[PDB]
Amino acid sequence: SLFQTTVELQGLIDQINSTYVDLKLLNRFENYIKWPW
Amino acid sequence: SLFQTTVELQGLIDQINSTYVDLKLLNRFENYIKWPW
Numbered sequence: 001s002l003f004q005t006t007v008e009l010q011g012l013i014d015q016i017n018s019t020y021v022d023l024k025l026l027n028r029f030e031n032y033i034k035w036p037w
Numbered sequence: 038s039l040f041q042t043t044v045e046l047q048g049l050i051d052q053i054n055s056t057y058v059d060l061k062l063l064n065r066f067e068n069y070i071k072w073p074w
């Protein structure tokens with residue numbers, strides 16, 4: 001039971017890590033390029 | 038073991054929740070200020 005819980009938690013951590021990386025990358029990309037495009 | 042798992046989960050939640058606050062602050066700031074520079 002503890003192993004299954006930890007595996008699910010690790011999958012969730014990986015997903016959240018990837019999604020925050022993507023969101024921060026999108027924010028930096030929108031800051032990098034000019035506005036009126 | 039359960040205390041360690043709960044501590045890891047709480048540490049994850051704190052980072053998630055602070056990241057959500059940080060993202061929403063930037064979103065609100067960008068909503069307040071008009072797009073043109």
Ligand SMILES: *[C@@H]1O[C@H](CO)[C@@H](O[C@@H]2O[C@H](CO)[C@@H](O[C@@H]3O[C@H](CO[C@H]4O[C@H](CO[C@H]5O[C@H](CO)[C@@H](O)[C@H](O)[C@@H]5O)[C@@H](O[C@H]5O[C@H](CO)[C@@H](O)[C@H](O)[C@@H]5O)[C@H](O)[C@@H]4O)[C@@H](O[C@H]4O[C@H](CO)[C@@H](O)[C@H](O)[C@@H]4O)[C@H](O)[C@@H]3O)[C@H](O)[C@H]2NC(C)=O)[C@H](O)[C@H]1NC(C)=O
Nearest residue numbers: 010011012013014015016017018019020021022024052056
């Ligand atoms: C979940 O999200 C997390 C984001 O919050 C993410 O963690 C971060 O991921 C980044 C990549 O996506 C990591 O960036 C890497 O940085 C490498 C450079 O590391 C050098 O510095 C280390 C220590 O520096 C720290 O402290 C200084 C201040 O002194 C600070 O400015 C830095 O930002 C760091 O915080 C060195 O580690 C050594 O020292 C520590 C103790 O401080 C020891 O514990 C270590 O064992 C070790 O002895 C390290 O050796 C490096 O010198 C990038 O490496 C580039 O540069 C080196 C030369 O420095 C080249 O040789 C490489 O080829 C490469 O070009 C690397 O590419 C990457 O950019 C970031 O470090 C992560 N942060 C933490 C805290 O871990 C998680 O990864 C993510 N989860 C998953 C699963 O992905």
Ligand SMILES: *[C@@H]1O[C@H](CO)[C@@H](O[C@@H]2O[C@H](CO)[C@@H](O[C@@H]3O[C@H](CO[C@H]4O[C@H](CO[C@H]5O[C@H](CO)[C@@H](O)[C@H](O)[C@@H]5O)[C@@H](O[C@H]5O[C@H](CO)[C@@H](O)[C@H](O)[C@@H]5O)[C@H](O)[C@@H]4O)[C@@H](O[C@H]4O[C@H](CO)[C@@H](O)[C@H](O)[C@@H]4O)[C@H](O)[C@@H]3O)[C@H](O)[C@H]2NC(C)=O)[C@H](O)[C@H]1NC(C)=O
Nearest residue numbers: 047048049050051052053054055056057058059060061062
């Ligand atoms: C870190 O993350 C945190 C969670 O992600 C976050 O906290 C969240 O903040 C939100 C607001 O920013 C909160 O949403 C509000 O919810 C109000 C409703 O609250 C009522 O229920 C409370 C109890 O909730 C429990 O039960 C529900 C199911 O009903 C469950 O979903 C919850 O998870 C809880 O288990 C009541 O609190 C009472 O009981 C607790 C103990 O359980 C006591 O400690 C309290 O002191 C209190 O006695 C509360 O009183 C409410 O009854 C929304 O209120 C609407 O509805 C009420 C009627 O119910 C109206 O009167 C209001 O006018 C309004 O219309 C409110 O609008 C908002 O949506 C969210 O609940 C928080 N989550 C948690 C877990 O607390 C943190 O903000 C975040 N950190 C930072 C820095 O942001």
